[PDB]
Design a protein around this ligand. Structure first.
Ligand SMILES: [Mg+2]
Ligand SMILES: [Mg+2]
Ligand SMILES: [Mg+2]
Ligand SMILES: [Mg+2]
Ligand SMILES: [Mg+2]
Ligand SMILES: [Mg+2]
Ligand SMILES: [Mg+2]
Ligand SMILES: [Mg+2]
Ligand SMILES: [Mg+2]
Ligand SMILES: [Mg+2]
Ligand SMILES: [Mg+2]
Ligand SMILES: [Mg+2]
Ligand SMILES: [Mg+2]
Ligand SMILES: [Mg+2]
Ligand SMILES: [Mg+2]
Ligand SMILES: [Mg+2]
Ligand SMILES: [Mg+2]
Ligand SMILES: [Mg+2]
Ligand SMILES: [Mg+2]
Ligand SMILES: [Mg+2]
Ligand SMILES: [Mg+2]
Ligand SMILES: [Mg+2]
Ligand SMILES: [Mg+2]
Ligand SMILES: [Mg+2]
Ligand SMILES: [Mg+2]
Ligand SMILES: [Mg+2]
Ligand SMILES: [Mg+2]
Ligand SMILES: [Mg+2]
Ligand SMILES: [Zn+2]
Lengths: 115, 136, 66, 177, 76, 52
RNA sequence: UGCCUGGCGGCCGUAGCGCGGUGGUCCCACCUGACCCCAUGCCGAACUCAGAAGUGAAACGCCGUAGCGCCGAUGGUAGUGUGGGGUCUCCCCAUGCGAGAGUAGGGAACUGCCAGGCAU
RNA sequence: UCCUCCUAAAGAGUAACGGAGGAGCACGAAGGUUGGCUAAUCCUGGUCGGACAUCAGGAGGUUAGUGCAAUGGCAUAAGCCAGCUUGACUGCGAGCGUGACGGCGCGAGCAGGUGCGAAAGCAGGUCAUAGUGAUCCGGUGGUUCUGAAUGGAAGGGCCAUC
RNA sequence: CCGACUUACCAACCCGAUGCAAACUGCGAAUACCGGAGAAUGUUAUCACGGGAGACACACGGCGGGUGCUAACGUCCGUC
């Protein structure tokens, strides 16, 4: 079940590489969750909002669920716009837009993002 | 005799006949007869030499042929004016470039093999001479 | 599992005449008995019975003697 | 769920002892039960397809798959896309509640039953088996079968060898031989 | 009889070779398949023509993990 | 072949028509495509008629 | 700073298969459980959610690994522009450019923005 | 007359009564988009099931497929499934490749209306290369452009079409 | 119903080894060709539009070739 994420994502991530817009990378793990942004070259990331940094996850009850995904989706906007990252495009990373990603990609829009 | 059981397409071009050989050395047995000149070997001549050399070996030992004719030579039929197409395949020819081996032999000793290869040399259009088994 | 297009499933008693009370859900509806119970079935006590070969000396000396 | 209440508590107590294992992962586990009752004769009536898509659906409570012919054969009057097969797949707890109805009732009920032979594991422990008739699952009315045509139960499991996958089923006194 | 026909090809190949400077809208390679792939700032057309979008110098760049020919456009 | 010419007439009341080709044999039921119209500028149903 | 582990990169088989060990505190997989959130052309197998009793077995990275694949010499080979010939159906000469296959060898990746854990 | 490889001499092009093959159609989806999936073949086990139906793993890894000939492509699949749709759009086009011209084809960016998708984005027919035909004359439906004294009408142009 | 029998028999899988190719390349030179930067060079020698005709039947010598038999002071080509 490892290769399915890579194979579904190598369309949209290569299409974002061909575009040149700044990419919003999501991750759907059962226990934890990652989210970050990345320059148009693909090797110099800027922010990192997750639940392995315990400083944000200590004020949240669980890590991998419907409300904590929204918490990390706010916590990436409120450390990305503070450095001033306005131009952004989102990679769904194969895990489809229902539930976790459905809350993460709109808690950012409630917390001020532009995509 | 030898002939291809199948060609992909029917009639091939002539080409040319440049280059040295590839199957240079004795590869299987002990004794060899090797071409020197430049030319063309048909389907009939090599099996005629096969009978003319088997008749001297007297069903002893073993002999190997490596060359196998596959060039679809043609003819234009007699008393037909030169146009109106190509011709139909009449026989099948092999190409022999200078240095290529034809047959190899084992078992039967070398002094018999002198005249036993000389008889099959005398029915062949290009000059050949004997070679031995080389240990590397 | 789709919510509609699969049939009924309700618990029903399946007792055997040798006394194996059991419950299983199915679609059969009515109380369904059992004839053959595999807690005393003739597979581990009752498949010797067929072989019936016999020594021919035994079939000889069962009917008379010398 | 009764046999699975038996399994996790009183099969590992043998399959941990007799085979020198470290973890609870090394023991084999059942994976799925598949029920193919194929009708290769449905070209003369569509009813013989759909009745064979209902007569095994009434056994185990799922609507089944009308699976199609994969490639084409000129001989047996088939092409790409003829619905000929019927398949049910069961996983989890419904697998156990069908395995109960097999091994407690429908295994001795078959006519001239003399066990089920000890080599059907295809070298990897994944089982295969085949009945000859339908009424031996006792969930049918007697004179309400149009024809007689068996199916073949296949117990796909996470067995790894023929020596080491058989003992799982033999721990439920599978009537071998 | 059996051997009468042929058809002249559509004059294909590389048109603006690798190294020099091209405009926008012109064609680099008119080709059959995706023989020279979707390089930087070129479009592959309906019949897989390689046409530039920007201006400037072309450059024939090997790239990719399966050794594919990409045809690039950068600003001169 | 028997794909013959047919005329898609605009249903906006204006006199506009496309021309396409349909198969009368395998699909003999009539055709309603919601196509663009240049004169009324809105996408309008196209009720079908003959090519004459 | 050091080591390990997680998404993304440069890289295009010296970077991949082989067989034998490995590491689960944290991370990752398995897993646990499932009614509304979604899910199957049958089915919690895939897909989604809720949670962490149990295991690092299978996956997943490391070291060991010349059975490979792969890279790769120097030297020799016929080809070959241009010019003179010959025993002109094809080869020799003076000049450069001189590769494929094989010999000696290398060879179990390397590296970068990033976050956590343990140590110094 | 057109289409595919080779002869054709590593760019285009290059002939003969030279060597081999296909076309003069189709498709209301076999189209646009979203989401998802991955083969041919043999081994082994299995109800009638046989060497070849369907079902199970398992080896192997495009040796398979494209509505059709080859050739070149193809995993992000351009191959195969489900949902919604009519962009199989209207006016345009910088700039090009190739013909002697009559041509033919690709085409970023714009306007006006949309479809898909949460979103960037994609879409001006089908993986591309064959599915073909100048002019005159003549028919259909619009068109206030003209209307041989004036208002009209016949007829002619105009764009769509046969 | 079965089956032990090898038997100068052939034969796909695969293996160590050997060749050939216009219609198949896991490799692949020279020379030839498009475009920029430059040194010396030649009677602008390179295109542009404008006036006027010629020609549209070619052969042989060397090289890479296709009909022909690697025959023809033979034929059909690209090239000097
Ligand atoms: Mg040769
Ligand atoms: Mg190991
Ligand atoms: Mg291991
Ligand atoms: Mg699972
Ligand atoms: Mg060399
Ligand atoms: Mg080399
Ligand atoms: Mg290596
Ligand atoms: Mg290794
Ligand atoms: Mg050429
Ligand atoms: Mg189609
Ligand atoms: Mg079989
Ligand atoms: Mg697609
Ligand atoms: Mg299609
Ligand atoms: Mg097509
Ligand atoms: Mg007027
Ligand atoms: Mg008037
Ligand atoms: Mg040639
Ligand atoms: Mg060649
Ligand atoms: Mg050339
Ligand atoms: Mg002039
Ligand atoms: Mg002439
Ligand atoms: Mg001439
Ligand atoms: Mg002439
Ligand atoms: Mg010549
Ligand atoms: Mg002559
Ligand atoms: Mg002449
Ligand atoms: Mg003449
Ligand atoms: Mg000449
Ligand atoms: Zn009883």
């Amino acid at each position: 079940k490892k290769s399915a994420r890579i194979r579904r994502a190598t369309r949209a991530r290569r299409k974002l590489q061909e575009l040149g817009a700044t990419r919003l990378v999501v991750h759907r793990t059962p226990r934890h969750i990652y989210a970050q942004v990345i320059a148009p070259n693909g090797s110099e990331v800027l922010v990192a909002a997750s639940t392995v940094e315990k400083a944000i996850a200590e004020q949240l009850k669980y890590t991998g669920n419907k409300d904590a995904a929204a918490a990390v989706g706010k916590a990436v906007a409120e450390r990305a716009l503070e450095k001033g990252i306005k131009d952004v495009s989102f990679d769904r990373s194969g895990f489809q837009y229902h539930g976790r990603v459905q809350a993460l990609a709109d808690a950012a829009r409630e917390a001020g993002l532009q995509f | 005799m030898l002939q291809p059981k199948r060609t992909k397409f029917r009639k091939m071009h002539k080409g040319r006949n440049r280059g040295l050989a590839q199957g240079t050395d004795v590869s299987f047995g002990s004794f060899g007869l090797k071409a020197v000149g430049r030319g063309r070997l048909t389907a009939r001549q090599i099996e005629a030499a096969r009978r003319a050399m088997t008749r001297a070996v007297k069903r002893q030992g073993k002999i190997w042929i490596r060359v196998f004719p596959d060039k679809p030579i043609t003819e234009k039929p007699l008393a037909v004016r030169m146009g109106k197409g190509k011709g139909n395949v009449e026989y099948w020819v092999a190409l022999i470039q200078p240095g290529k081996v034809l047959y190899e032999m084992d078992g039967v000793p070398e002094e018999l093999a002198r005249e036993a290869f000389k008889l099959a040399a005398a029915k062949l259009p290009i000059k050949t001479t004997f070679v031995t088994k080389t240990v590397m | 599992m789709k919510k509609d297009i699969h049939p009924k499933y309700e618990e029903i008693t399946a007792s055997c005449s040798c006394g194996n009370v059991m419950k299983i859900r199915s679609t059969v509806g009515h109380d369904l008995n059992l004839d053959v119970c595999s807690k005393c079935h003739p597979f581990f006590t009752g498949k010797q019975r067929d072989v019936a070969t016999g020594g021919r000396v035994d079939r000889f000396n069962k009917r008379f003697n010398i | 769920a009764k046999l699975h209440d038996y399994y996790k508590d009183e099969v590992v107590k043998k399959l941990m002892t007799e085979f020198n294992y470290n973890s609870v992962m090394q023991v084999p586990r059942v994976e799925k039960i598949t029920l193919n009752m194929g009708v290769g004769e449905a070209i003369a009536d569509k009813k013989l397809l759909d009745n064979a898509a209902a007569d095994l659906a009434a056994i185990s409570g799922q609507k089944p798959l009308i699976t199609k012919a994969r490639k084409s054969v000129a001989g047996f009057k088939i092409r790409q896309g003829y619905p000929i097969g019927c398949k049910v797949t069961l996983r989890g707890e419904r697998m156990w509640e069908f395995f109960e109805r097999l091994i407690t009732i429908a295994v001795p009920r078959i006519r001239d039953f003399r066990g089920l032979s000890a080599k059907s594991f295809d070298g990897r422990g994944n089982y295969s088996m085949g009945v000859r008739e339908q009424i031996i699952f006792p969930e049918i009315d007697y004179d309400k079968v149009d024809r007689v045509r068996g199916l073949d139960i296949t117990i796909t499991t996470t067995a790894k060898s023929d020596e080491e996958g058989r003992a799982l089923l033999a721990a439920f006194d599978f009537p071998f031989r | 009889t059996r051997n009468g026909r042929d058809s002249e090809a559509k004059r294909l190949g590389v048109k603006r070779f690798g190294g020099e400077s091209v405009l926008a809208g012109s064609i680099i390679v008119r080709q059959r398949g995706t023989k020279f792939h979707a390089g930087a700032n070129v479009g592959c057309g309906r019949d897989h023509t390689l046409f530039a979008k920007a201006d400037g110098k072309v450059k024939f760049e090997v790239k990719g993990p399966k050794n594919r020919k990409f045809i690039s456009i950068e600003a001169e | 072949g028997i794909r013959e010419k047919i005329k898609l007439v605009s249903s906006a009341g204006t006199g506009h028509f496309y021309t396409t080709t349909k198969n009368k044999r395998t699909k003999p039921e009539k055709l309603e495509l919601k196509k663009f119209d240049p004169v009324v500028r809105q996408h309008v149903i196209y009720k079908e008629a003959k090519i004459k």
